[PDB]
Ligand binder design. Structure first.
Ligand SMILES: [Cl-]
Ligand SMILES: [Cl-]
Ligand SMILES: [Y+3]
Ligand SMILES: [Y+3]
Length: 159
């Protein structure tokens, strides 16, 4: 997977909304309780170059807040995690002020664990960001794609 060259991770800080998401396995994203159905609400880069990912997940019939610490690697756009049965976070592209495309995978099973998201800065459908999302997904073996309306973006767990 091609990741972003020259990522300045400090510029991704602040509020984001999960506008769209895709996975290689349908079961990873199908239900609301599906293991990779996650909603990014905030990205908090640390001064040491790591990424605190704040997100929402639907578990036990209710919406819960999760925090994931993504550890920096030699490659600026590739981070290490230990959550959601994934071990990697990969930023594909961002303009910092509008959109951000990122993926998650488990390196042991890189085929069946892939989930990617289109994040936007405002709770609006951004078609230009969705075009770039789909252009990035072309070379990826996705079998499920989800997108959300502006009202869903502002609701807890995209209800
Ligand atoms: Cl740390
Ligand atoms: Cl709106
Ligand atoms: Y660290
Ligand atoms: Y509007």
């Amino acid at each position: 997977t091609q990741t972003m060259k020259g990522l300045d991770i400090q510029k991704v800080a602040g509020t984001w909304y999960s506008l769209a998401m895709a996975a290689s396995d349908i079961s990873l994203l199908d239900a609301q309780s599906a293991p990779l159905r996650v909603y990014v609400e905030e990205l908090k880069p640390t001064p040491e170059g790591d990424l605190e990912i704040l997100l929402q997940k639907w578990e036990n019939g209710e919406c819960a807040q999760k925090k994931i610490i993504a550890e920096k690697t030699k490659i600026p756009a590739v981070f290490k995690i230990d959550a959601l049965n994934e071990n990697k976070v990969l930023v594909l592209d961002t303009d910092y002020k509008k959109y951000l495309l990122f993926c998650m995978e488990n390196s042991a099973e890189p085929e069946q664990s892939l989930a990617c998201q289109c994040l936007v800065r405002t709770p609006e459908v951004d078609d230009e960001a969705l075009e770039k999302f789909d252009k990035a997904l072309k070379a990826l073996p996705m079998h499920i794609r989800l997108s959300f309306n502006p009202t869903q973006l502002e609701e807890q767990c995209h209800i």
